[PDB]
Amino acid sequence: YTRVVWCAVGPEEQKKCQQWSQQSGQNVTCATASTTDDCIVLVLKGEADALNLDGGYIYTAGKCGLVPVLAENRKSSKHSSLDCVLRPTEGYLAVAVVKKANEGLTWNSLKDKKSCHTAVDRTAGWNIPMGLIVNQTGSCAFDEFFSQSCAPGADPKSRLCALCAGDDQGLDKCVPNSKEKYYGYTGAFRCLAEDVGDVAFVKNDTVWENTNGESTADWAKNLKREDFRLLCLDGTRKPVTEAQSCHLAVAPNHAVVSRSDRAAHVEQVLLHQQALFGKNGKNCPDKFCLFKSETKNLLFNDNTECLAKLGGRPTYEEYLGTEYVTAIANLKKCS
C-alpha cells in the first residue's frame, strides 16, 4: 500500500528493474515496453507509475498530462554544503563531437556527413541539433541533411537508420532502446568512436566518461580525449575541455515523471529507495546500486549522484523551461 510500478525500456532495463524489485522487497515492481513512448502510454493507462526521462521525452509525456517528480542530480562544484536531494539541478551541456583526425569538419560543413544521435526526440541527440539545423538551413527536410545516420526511433529503412547496427544478432536495427548498439549517449559516442559516423550529438559528460580509462568496455578502453574535438556554433573546433564555451545548448536534467495522481507516492518511495540503493546508500554496493549499470545508463544515468527535489512544484513547461519548449514545438512543426 502502495507498490510503485516502474517502466523499463527494453530487456536490459527490465533485468535491472527486476533486481531492484527483488532488493526492494517488491516495494517497486516492473512493467516493460520496447520504447520510451510505449512506457509513457503504459503510464497514461495506469499500467505503470513512473520512469526517468530525457527532457525531449518529458515534453511528450507532459503534453499527455504526466508531471515531473524528482530530477537527476549529478556531481556539482558550487552549492557544496547543500545535501544532493536539496541542491538545484544545473543542466548538462549538449555538444557535437567529432574526431580530431577528421580535420576541417566544422559545424558549417556537416551537410552530407554521417551522424550518430542518441535517439529521435531526445534533447542533445536530436531536438537541439536538428532544431538548430532546420533553423539554419530554413528547411524542414532534416531527414535529407546528413547522408546517413543512426537516429534510433526513425524508419529503419530510411537513411536516418542506415548506420544503426541492431543487437548482437543484428536484429532490432534502429530500435530506440539499449539493445541497439548505437543507442543513447554511450551508443552514439560509440558510433563516432568506431568511425561509423563523422559526428555524435551527445553531452559533455559522455565524452569524459568513455575516454582515458574512465570506461573499461572494449570499445572505449583505448580511447583518448585528445583524439576528439567539439564543434562550436561559430564554426570553430575546440578540445573537449572547453565544453563551457563550445556547446549547442544547456539541457534540463533527466527526470522522473508520473501521473499527477501518483506523483506524491512515487516521490516518497523514490526518496526511500535511493537512501537504500543510491550513491552512498545503505545497501550499495553490497546488495544493489540503483545508479550503476556498467556505463549503460539503464533506468538512470550512471553519473547520477541522487534524485533531487524540484523547487516550485513545476509543471513540465516550467521544468523544461519556456525556450526549450518553444524550440521543440518549432521543430515538431516539420513533422
Binding site: V41, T60, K63, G65
Partner: peptide, 6 residues
C-alpha cells in the same frame, strides 16, 4: 497544434 501524441 497543442494535444497529446497518443
Amino acid at each position: 497544434l497543442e494535444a497529446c501524441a497518443f
